[PDB]
Amino acid sequence: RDDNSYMYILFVMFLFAVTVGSLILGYTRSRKVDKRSDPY
Amino acid sequence: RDDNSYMYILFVMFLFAVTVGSLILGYTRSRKVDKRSDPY
Amino acid sequence: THVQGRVYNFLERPTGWKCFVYHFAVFLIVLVCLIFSVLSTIEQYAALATGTLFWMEIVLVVFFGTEYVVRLWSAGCRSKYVGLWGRLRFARKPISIIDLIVVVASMVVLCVGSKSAIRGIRFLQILRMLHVDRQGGTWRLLGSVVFIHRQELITTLYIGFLGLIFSSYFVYLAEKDAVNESGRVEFGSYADALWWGVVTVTTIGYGDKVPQTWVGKTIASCFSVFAISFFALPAGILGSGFALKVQQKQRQKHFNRQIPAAASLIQTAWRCYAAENPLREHHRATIKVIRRMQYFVAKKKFQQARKPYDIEQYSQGHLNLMVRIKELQRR
Amino acid sequence: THVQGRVYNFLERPTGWKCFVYHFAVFLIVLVCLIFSVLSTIEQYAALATGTLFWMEIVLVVFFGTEYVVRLWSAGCRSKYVGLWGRLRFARKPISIIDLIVVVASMVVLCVGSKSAIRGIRFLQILRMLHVDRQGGTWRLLGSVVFIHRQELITTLYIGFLGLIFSSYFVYLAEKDAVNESGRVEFGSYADALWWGVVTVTTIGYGDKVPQTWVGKTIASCFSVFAISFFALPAGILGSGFALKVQQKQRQKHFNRQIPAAASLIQTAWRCYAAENPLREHHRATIKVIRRMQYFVAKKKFQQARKPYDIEQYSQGHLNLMVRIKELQRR
Amino acid sequence: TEEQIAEFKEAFSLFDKDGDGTITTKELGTVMRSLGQNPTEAELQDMINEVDADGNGTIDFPEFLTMMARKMKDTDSEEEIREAFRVFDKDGNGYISAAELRHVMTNLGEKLTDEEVDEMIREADIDGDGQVNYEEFVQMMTAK
Numbered sequence: 001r002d003d004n005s006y007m008y009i010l011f012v013m014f015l016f017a018v019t020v021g022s023l024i025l026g027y028t029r030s031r032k033v034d035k036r037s038d039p040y
Numbered sequence: 041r042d043d044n045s046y047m048y049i050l051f052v053m054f055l056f057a058v059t060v061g062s063l064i065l066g067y068t069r070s071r072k073v074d075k076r077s078d079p080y
Numbered sequence: 081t082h083v084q085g086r087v088y089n090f091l092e093r094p095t096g097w098k099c100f101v102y103h104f105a106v107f108l109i110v111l112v113c114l115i116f117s118v119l120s121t122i123e124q125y126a127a128l129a130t131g132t133l134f135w136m137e138i139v140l141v142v143f144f145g146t147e148y149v150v151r152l153w154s155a156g157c158r159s160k161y162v163g164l165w166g167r168l169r170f171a172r173k174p175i176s177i178i179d180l181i182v183v184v185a186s187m188v189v190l191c192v193g194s195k196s197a198i199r200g201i202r203f204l205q206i207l208r209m210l211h212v213d214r215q216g217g218t219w220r221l222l223g224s225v226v227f228i229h230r231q232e233l234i235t236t237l238y239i240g241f242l243g244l245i246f247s248s249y250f251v252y253l254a255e256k257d258a259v260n261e262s263g264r265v266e267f268g269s270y271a272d273a274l275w276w277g278v279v280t281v282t283t284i285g286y287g288d289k290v291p292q293t294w295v296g297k298t299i300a301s302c303f304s305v306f307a308i309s310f311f312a313l314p315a316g317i318l319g320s321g322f323a324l325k326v327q328q329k330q331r332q333k334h335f336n337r338q339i340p341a342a343a344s345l346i347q348t349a350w351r352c353y354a355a356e357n358p359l360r361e362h363h364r365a366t367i368k369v370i371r372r373m374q375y376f377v378a379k380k381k382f383q384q385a386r387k388p389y390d391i392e393q394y395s396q397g398h399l400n401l402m403v404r405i406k407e408l409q410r411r
Numbered sequence: 412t413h414v415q416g417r418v419y420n421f422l423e424r425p426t427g428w429k430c431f432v433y434h435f436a437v438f439l440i441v442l443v444c445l446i447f448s449v450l451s452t453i454e455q456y457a458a459l460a461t462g463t464l465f466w467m468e469i470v471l472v473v474f475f476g477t478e479y480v481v482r483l484w485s486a487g488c489r490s491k492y493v494g495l496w497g498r499l500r501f502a503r504k505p506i507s508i509i510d511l512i513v514v515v516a517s518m519v520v521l522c523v524g525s526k527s528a529i530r531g532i533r534f535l536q537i538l539r540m541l542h543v544d545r546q547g548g549t550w551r552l553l554g555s556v557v558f559i560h561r562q563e564l565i566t567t568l569y570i571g572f573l574g575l576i577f578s579s580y581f582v583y584l585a586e587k588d589a590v591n592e593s594g595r596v597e598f599g600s601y602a603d604a605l606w607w608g609v610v611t612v613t614t615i616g617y618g619d620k621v622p623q624t625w626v627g628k629t630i631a632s633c634f635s636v637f638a639i640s641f642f643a644l645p646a647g648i649l650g651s652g653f654a655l656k657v658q659q660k661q662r663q664k665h666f667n668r669q670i671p672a673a674a675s676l677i678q679t680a681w682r683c684y685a686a687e688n689p690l691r692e693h694h695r696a697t698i699k700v701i702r703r704m705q706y707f708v709a710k711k712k713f714q715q716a717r718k719p720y721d722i723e724q725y726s727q728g729h730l731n732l733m734v735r736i737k738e739l740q741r742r
Numbered sequence: 743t744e745e746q747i748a749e750f751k752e753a754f755s756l757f758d759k760d761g762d763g764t765i766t767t768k769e770l771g772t773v774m775r776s777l778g779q780n781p782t783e784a785e786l787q788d789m790i791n792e793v794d795a796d797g798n799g800t801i802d803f804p805e806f807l808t809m810m811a812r813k814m815k816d817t818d819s820e821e822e823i824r825e826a827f828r829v830f831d832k833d834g835n836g837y838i839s840a841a842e843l844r845h846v847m848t849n850l851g852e853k854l855t856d857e858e859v860d861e862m863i864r865e866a867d868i869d870g871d872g873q874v875n876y877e878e879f880v881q882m883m884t885a886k
C-alpha cells in the first residue's frame with residue numbers, strides 16, 4: 001500500500017539536491033578560472 | 041523463466057574481458073623485459 | 081565585446097553570489113518538475129500530474145531552447161574558438177552534446193505528443209540533472225584517480241572476476257539438480273549461479289538463492305571470504321586516491337597565490353631604489369612617500385603568502401631544520 | 412638464431428602493437444567459445460550449441476597443440492635453459508604446467524567423446540582464460556603484498572576465526588531446539604550454526620537462518636559488531652599494500668631510466684675533452700662539431716631524466732631545502 | 743674570439759657541400775655517416791631539435807655559433823656533470839673504483855672504445871687506489 005509513498009521520492013531527491021547545491025556553490029564561490037597561468 | 045537470460049552471461053563475461061583487455065594492453069605497451077639489469 | 085564577454089562569465093564557469101541563485105534555482109525547477117513527473121507512476125497520486133505539468137514542460141523546453149542559443153552566441157569571447165566555424169569545437173564539449181540532445185530530443189517528443197508518449201519525458205527529464213553541474217569538475221577528478229590507480233584496479237578486478245567465474249561454476253556443479261523448501265530449483269542454469277556469484281561477491285545477500293547441498297555451502301564459504309576481500313579493495317584504493325588529489329590541488333592553488341605576492345615585493349623594491357631619477361622637483365618629493373608606503377603593504381602580502389600554509393601542521397619533520405641551517409649560515 | 416629469437420619475443424613476454432592483436436583476439440576466441448559453451452545449460456537456449464561448436468573445439472585444441480610446441484621450440488633463446496634437457500625447467504613455469512594440462516586433458520576428453528562427456532569441456536574451457544594472461548604479473552603483486560603484510564592478516568584472521576568458532580557455539584546452545592515460523596528448526600546442528608557464523612561474519616545476511624530466541628539475538632548482535640570489524644580489516648590492509656607496491660615500482664622504473672642518461676653525459680663529456688688526439692687532419696676537423704653536437708642532446712636527456720618525476724608533487728617537504736644548501740655551498 | 747669567428751663558418755656550411763647558409767640536417771645524416779657514425783633518423787632529427795634554437799633545421803649560425811659560444815666549463819654546466827657521478831655514488835665520498843668505473847664505462851649509454859676507457863681513468867687514479875674521485879676528474883674537465 002502506497003499511503004505516504006510521496007515521502008521517499010521527496011526525501012531522496014532532496015538529499016541529492018543538497019549534494020548538488022554544495023557543488024554549484026563550490027564553483028560560484030571559486031576565486032579564478034585562469035586555465036594556463038599557474039607555472040609561468 | 042529464462043526469457044532474456046543470455047544477457048547476464050553476455051554482461052559478466054564482457055566485464056571480465058574488459059578487465060583482461062587492459063591487462064594484455066598493459067604488457068604489450070610495456071617498455072622493456074630485461075630481467076636482471078636493474079642494479080648493475 | 082563588453083556586451084558579450086560578461087555573459088560568458090554569467091552562464092559558463094560562473095562566479096558571483098547571483099550566479100549561484102541563477103544556476104541553483106534552475107536546478108530547483110528541474111527537481112520539482114522531476115518529482116512531479118515521477119509521482120505520476122504511483123497509481124494513487126497520478127491525479128496530481130495534470131496537463132499543466134505538460135505545459136510547464138513546453139515552457140521549460142522554450143526556456144532551454146533559447147538558453148543554448150545564448151550560450152552559443154556568447155561563446156566567441158574565447159581564444160580557443162572564434163566566429164561561427166570555430167564555435168563547432170565548442171560544441172564538442174560533451175556537456176553541450178548532452179544539452180543539445182536534451183533540448184532537441186525533448187522538443188521532438190513534445191511535438192509528436194501534441195498533434196508511451198509521456199514515458200519518454202521521464203528519461204529526458206532525468207537527463208537535465210547532469211547539464212546544470214557545469215565545468216565537469218567532478219568527473220575530471222574520478223577519471224584521473226582511476227587512471228593513476230589503473231594497475232591495482234585492473235589487478236583486483238581481474239582476480240575477483242576470475243574467482244567469480246571459477247567458483248560460481250563449482251556451485252552449479254554441486255547444485256544442478258536440487259529443489260528448494262518450496263518446490264522450485266534455484267540453480268537451474270549457469271546464469272542463475274552467476275547472478276548468485278555477483279550478488280554474493282558484493283555482499284548483498286538477497287536470499288533468493290542459497291545453496292542447499294552441503295558441498296556447495298563449503299565452496300560458498302571459501303569464495304565468500306577470498307573474494308569479498310578483493311571486491312572490497314577499490315573502496316580503500318579510491319578513498320586514498322581522492323584525498324591525495326585534492327591535497328595536490330591545494331599545493332598548486334597556494335603556489336599560484338605565492339607568485340604574484342613574490343612579484344609585488346621585488347617589483348616594488350626596485351621602485352623603492354629608483355628614487356634618483358624616474359618645476360619637476362616637488363612632484364618627486366611626493367613619490368618617496370608612496371614608494372615606501374606600498375612597499376610595506378607588499379611586504380605584508382608576501383608574509384601572508386607563505387606563513388598561512390593551508391592540515392597546516394606539516395612542519396613536523398623539519399621543525400628545527402629550517403632554523404639549524406640559517407644560524408649555521410650566519411656564522 | 413634470428414629465425415628463432417624473434418618468435419620468443421612474439422609469443423612470450425610480448426611487445427609491439429600486433430602482439431596485442433594476437434594475444435587478445437585469441438582471448439576473444441576463448442571467450443565466445445566459453446559463452447556458447449555455457450549458454451547450453453539454460454534448457455531453452457540449448458539448441459544453439461550444435462556439433463559445429465564441438466568441431467570448433469577440436470580445431471581449437473589443434474591450434475593449441477601446435478602453439479605449445481611452437482613456444483617449446485622457441486624456448487632455446489634463453490640463458491636460463493638451452494637445448495632439450497635444459498628446456499624441462501622451462502616447463503616448471505606453472506603457466507606452462509597449466510597450459511599442458513589444458514591442451515592434453517582437453518584432447519583426451521575430446522578423443523573419448525568421439526569414438527558427462529560434454530560436461531568436462533566446460534572446466535577445461537574455463538581454464539583457458541588463465542593461460543593467455545602471460546608473465547604472471549598479477550599474482551606476483553598479490554603474493555608479495557600478502558607476504559609483506561603477513562602479520563596483520565594472520566592476526567585478524569586468527570581473531571575473527573576465534574570469534575566465529577566461539578560465539579557461533581553460544582547461538583547453537585541458545586537455539587538448539589526452536590522452530591521457525593514455517594515449522595522447521597533452523598539451528599539443528601553445529602554446522603548450521605557455523606554456516607550462520609560465516610555468513611553473518613562476512614555481512615552477507617542471506618536470511619535463511621535468523622536466531623528466534625531472544626538470548627541468541629543478543630549474542631548475534633555482540634558477535635556481529637565485534638567480528639564484522641575484524642573481517643572487514645583486510646580490505647583496507649591490502650588496499651594500502653597494493654597502492655604502495657606500484658609506487659615502489661615507479662621509483663625503480665624511473666631509476667632505471669636515470670642511469671643510461673647519467674652515463675650518456677659523462678661518456679660524452681670525456682669524448683668532448685678528448686679533442687687532442689683520438690692527410691689525417693681534416694677528418695679531425697669534423698669530429699669537433701659532432702662531439703659538441705651530441706653532447707647537448709645528452710644534456711637534454713639528462714635533464715629530462717630527473718625533472719619529470721612521475722604524484723609528481725613530492726617536493727613538498729624539501730621545497731627550500733634543495734636550494735638552501737647550494738647557496739650556502741657557493742659561499 | 744676575433745680570430746675564430748671567420749674560419750669557423752667555412753666548417754659550418756661544410757656539410758651541405760655547397761656555399762649556402764645551411765646547417766644541412768638532411769645532409770648531416772650523410773656527413774656523419776661518411777665520418778663513420780651512421781645514426782638513425784630519429785636521433786638525427788633530435789640533433790637540430792636542441793642544437794638549432796631557431797627551429798628550421800638549417801641555419802646561418804644563430805645557434806650554430808651559440809653552440810660554439812657555450813664553453814661547457816663554467817659553473818652552469820659543471821654541477822650537472824658532477825651530478826652524473828652522484829647517480830653512481832655508493833656510501834658517499836665518490837668511492838668509484840677503477841673496476842666499477844670500467845664496469846660503468848663499457849656498458850651503458852654511448853660506450854667508449856677499450857683504448858679510450860682503459861686510459862680514461864688513468865689520470866683520475868694517479869694514486870693507484872680504488873677511488874677515482876669526481877673532483878679529480880672535473881678538474882680535468884675544467885678545461886672542457
Ligand SMILES: [Ca+2]
Nearest residue numbers: 764765766800
Ligand atoms: Ca639546406
Ligand SMILES: [Ca+2]
Nearest residue numbers: 796797798799
Ligand atoms: Ca632554424
